[PDB]
Design a protein around this ligand. Structure first.
Ligand code: 5GP
Ligand code: MYR
Ligand code: MYR
Ligand code: MYR
Ligand code: CA
Lengths: 267, 283, 68, 267, 68
């Protein structure tokens, strides 16, 4: 080729375009690409709404910061987008929604930094609640943070008494807050942003569920988790910091069951 | 006649000195390591006949695992009527062996083979006489009326599927279709049974979150059909599940720590799977 | 309505080749109207480890630079 | 036919359906039906968003009331829908929007009532301001009432002083508030709901403009006006009243120029 | 005297098409001289909802005026 590097890559959807001159290929979850519901697999009989460009584009979440103390981060699809432009509107005005996404995790440093982020895309990412007084005790509000998403910790201190600390996930990093060694989180579609190698991560994911289309406002198909498999490090300070940005783009979105808009409980 | 697929054989190879380096890679891509003997050392030719014939999901799940143990007591004493029967909630979370295996996959789809084993014994010194026992297992799907007493009209089973065992005979067993109301069985569920709207508790949901909040397969109402005798008798019925004609999707890591409840939930009491090793250089 | 099939090579059996004699044939006659009642589905050794070990978009071949 | 009456009629769009057992045919504005922008007529080069069912359906406006005193009513497309479900969202998230609509004016009475409503659909419905101290003096807020729309009067009293009464239309009925005898408002696509004859009015209208697609948030292509050419009347009271309901449905809607959402000035 | 027939599509079964493999065949051999002794009669999905939902004399078609 004319030097078509495996590192350089461009992505486009709607009126949005990502670029990256240091990526490490890109992966397509389970080898399947986003598709629409085929007349033989359909369920809802009403004519679907397929937003196309208006909603199938690149929405960028508020960046977070990687510190030597950082323990990890997490988000939920479609949740962490429920407020993203047009996509959201459609998501909330419809009972049933279906979608796949292209996840692009960014994080540049310098040839003098060290660090390695494990970007995993886990389907049906259910975490344990923080209270050994109850089970599956998590409030909707806490389960669905949105653009902010959660963070992982390295300690487990349940509040059996304080019932307002129980109603939230116990994001235990070395166990994915699921009760499974993170060391095997690789059996999930993933990429690793090793600073000395790349600065981007691109993971295209197809809708996944025991159903064709589901109700987004209740269920988060995917869960995005980023754990520093290698701690950030800089020769200079002993308190280095680098931004990590997450840009998601839905694809092949279609909805059924249109009514008045959904507005969930909030604070 | 056909030949089962064998695991990669080893073709003989030798030296090398090329710009072809199968040894090096970049796992950042998300792709696992691929190298094999041939790529790294000099190999001989080896004809492999062995097959992963036993790792086939159907083989891996091909066992009648015990899922629960129900108890009930046919007694003639005052408050021993509610004891004359029992209602079990259909699920595989009552134990941990089978559960963990299924838990290897996010979704699964299969037919089910139920097998029941009854074992009766005498409680106190009421070691007297009692005729032979005839039990009844009645499957009560979600929505069907449940037994009030060990003998109210419900045990007619004009529609509910019921087994009738005559203690001493072969362990009754039966088959069940894939009954899920979904296109597959969901093993996990990062969602809530319903959507809590604007004007509600700032905690709403904590009650209805988790696969458990949406899944429901009904219950097994067991009982002895005989009437109460002088001496009280105690029976223990064990439920066995073998998922057959199976297929699963999306692999996940195995449950590493003890199970708390039906959900993922962990207990601070036991969350140290691994084991301290003297040194990083300790063989 | 019976269907004969090949058995699973045993102890003193056909060279792994499973192609020696009708003495390795077992008969099967489904007795119930509902498929669910049938024995374990036939052993299927098919597999595609790649959807897990290499779901990368652009394909890379061993001998090449993983990162070009 | 099997008695296919010119009176009975059904209409369907999205998940909405109108019916009427007493209509008087239906008219198609200027004889043309709603269409999309053809590759040879296009202007904006970005891939358009075509909502289809999600927005091209039947939205019903708050009914008004016909009184012996009633002088008339008016509304503006797309304005009087800017808040209608999904249509609105798309309308506001995009710089450019294009659409045609199916207008269905309802108003049943009884074989003992009298009355005749002239339902006109006027393109570029510009009305005079109420203040002879200034010209074309109308505030955005007043020009764009929405679901409520305005009302016609039969008097003209400009507020040359009070500058908060000038910034609004001078809805003079016998002149369409335009300075043209309403008697000739029929040179516009229209129907007449004469109570003794029909109880519905159906007017399908195609996009109309000196451009292919325009900016909806600034411009109202059509204007719906209803004038009682015949005063409502009932043998019983001398203060009869009957509800008039307006249900509009956009069609062949497409938008270009997606960005952050538009939120106009309000009170 | 045996009669083979199609089973009822189960879990991991033929695409609903019930037209995939002889592995969906069940055999039947009546053993008694009296029909009454036989299994459930073969599933019959025929139906005429109209004798109940439309036993009207003159037929009317959806798209037309029910009362002309
Ligand atoms: N390793 C090896 N390379 C050889 C030999 N003779 C020539 N070559 C050179 O090494 C290249 C690669 O062969 P080798 O099998 O890696 C050949 O194309 C040739 O240029 C030999 O005996 N051994
Ligand atoms: C007469 C006995 C009837 C037994 C009915 C059992 C219903 C089967 C439900 C499926 C349970 C296993 C599925 C799962 O939880 O993954
Ligand atoms: C195909 O089925 C022809 C071979 C039949 C051989 C007889 C098998 C024994 C009977 C099978 C069960 C029938 C139950 C009614
Ligand atoms: C048709 O019936 C030919 C196949 C016969 C196969 C043998 C089935 C076993 C015997 C059936 C019951 C006979 C009772 C006297
Ligand atoms: Ca081999």
């Amino acid at each position: 080729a004319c030097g078509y590097s495996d590192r350089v890559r461009q992505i486009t959807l709607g009126n949005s375009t990502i670029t990256t001159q240091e990526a490490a290929n890109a992966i397509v979850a389970y080898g399947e690409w986003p598709t629409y519901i085929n007349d033989s697999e359909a369920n809802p009989v009403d004519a679907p709404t397929e937003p196309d460009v208006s909603s199938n584009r690149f929405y960028t979440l508020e960046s977070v910061s990687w510190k030597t103390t950082s323990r990890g981060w997490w988000w939920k699809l479609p949740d962490c987008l429920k407020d993203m432009g047009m996509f959201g509107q459609n998501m909330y005005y419809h009972y049933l929604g279906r979608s796949g996404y292209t996840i692009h995790v960014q994080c540049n440093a310098s040839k003098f930094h060290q660090g390695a982020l494990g970007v995993f895309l886990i389907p049906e990412f259910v975490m344990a609640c923080n209270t050994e007084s109850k089970t599956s005790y998590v409030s909707y509000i806490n389960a669905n943070p949105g653009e902010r998403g959660g963070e992982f910790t390295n300690t487990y201190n349940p509040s059996n008494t304080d019932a307002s600390e129980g109603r939230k996930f116990a994001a235990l990093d070395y166990l994915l807050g699921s009760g499974v060694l993170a060391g095997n989180a690789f059996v999930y579609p993933h990429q690793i942003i090793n600073l000395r190698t790349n600065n981007s991560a691109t993971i295209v994911v197809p809708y996944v569920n025991s159903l064709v289309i589901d109700c987004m406002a209740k269920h988060n198909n995917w869960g995005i988790v980023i754990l520093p498999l290698a701690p950030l490090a800089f020769a200079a300070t002993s308190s280095p910091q680098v931004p990590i940005t997450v840009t998601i783009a839905p694809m092949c979105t279609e909805f059924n069951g249109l009514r008045n808009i959904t507005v969930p409980v909030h604070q | 006649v056909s030949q089962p697929p064998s695991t990669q054989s080893t073709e003989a190879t030798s030296g090398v000195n090329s710009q072809e380096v199968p040894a090096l890679t970049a796992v950042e891509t998300g792709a696992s390591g691929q190298a094999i003997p041939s790529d790294v050392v000099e190999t001989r030719h080896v004809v492999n006949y062995k097959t992963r014939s036993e790792s086939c999901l159907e083989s891996f799940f091909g066992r009648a695992a015990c899922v629960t143990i129900l108890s009930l007591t046919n007694s003639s004493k005052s408050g021993e009527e509610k004891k004359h029967f029992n209602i079990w909630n259909i699920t595989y979370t009552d134990t941990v062996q089978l559960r963990r295996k299924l838990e290897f996959f996010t979704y699964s789809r299969f037919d089910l083979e139920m097998t029941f084993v009854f074992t009766e014994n005498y409680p106190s010194t009421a070691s007297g006489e009692v005729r032979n026992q005839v039990y009844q297992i009645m499957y009560i799907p979600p929505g069907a009326p449940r037994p009030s007493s060990w003998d109210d009209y419900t045990w007619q089973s004009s529609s509910n599927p019921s087994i009738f065992y005559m203690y001493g005979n072969a362990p009754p067993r039966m088959s069940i279709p894939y009954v899920g109301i979904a296109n597959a069985y969901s093993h996990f569920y990062d969602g809530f049974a319903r959507v809590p709207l604007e004007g509600e508790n700032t905690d709403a949901g904590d009650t209805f979150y988790g696969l458990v909040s949406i899944n429901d397969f009904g219950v097994l109402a067991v009982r002895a059909v005989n009437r109460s005798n002088p001496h009280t008798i105690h029976t223990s019925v064990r439920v066995y599940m073998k998922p057959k004609h199976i297929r699963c999707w999306c692999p996940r890591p195995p449950r590493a720590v003890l199970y708390r409840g039906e959900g993922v939930d962990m207990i601070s009491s036991a969350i140290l799977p691994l084991t301290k090793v003297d040194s990083i250089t300790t063989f | 309505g019976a269907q004969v099939s090949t058995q699973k090579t045993g102890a003193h059996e056909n060279q792994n080749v499973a192609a020696n004699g009708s003495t390795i044939n077992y008969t099967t006659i489904n007795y119930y109207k509902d498929s669910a009642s049938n024995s374990a589905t036939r052993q299927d050794l098919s597999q595609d480890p790649s959807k897990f070990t290499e779901p990368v978009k652009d394909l890379m071949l061993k001998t090449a630079p993983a990162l070009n």
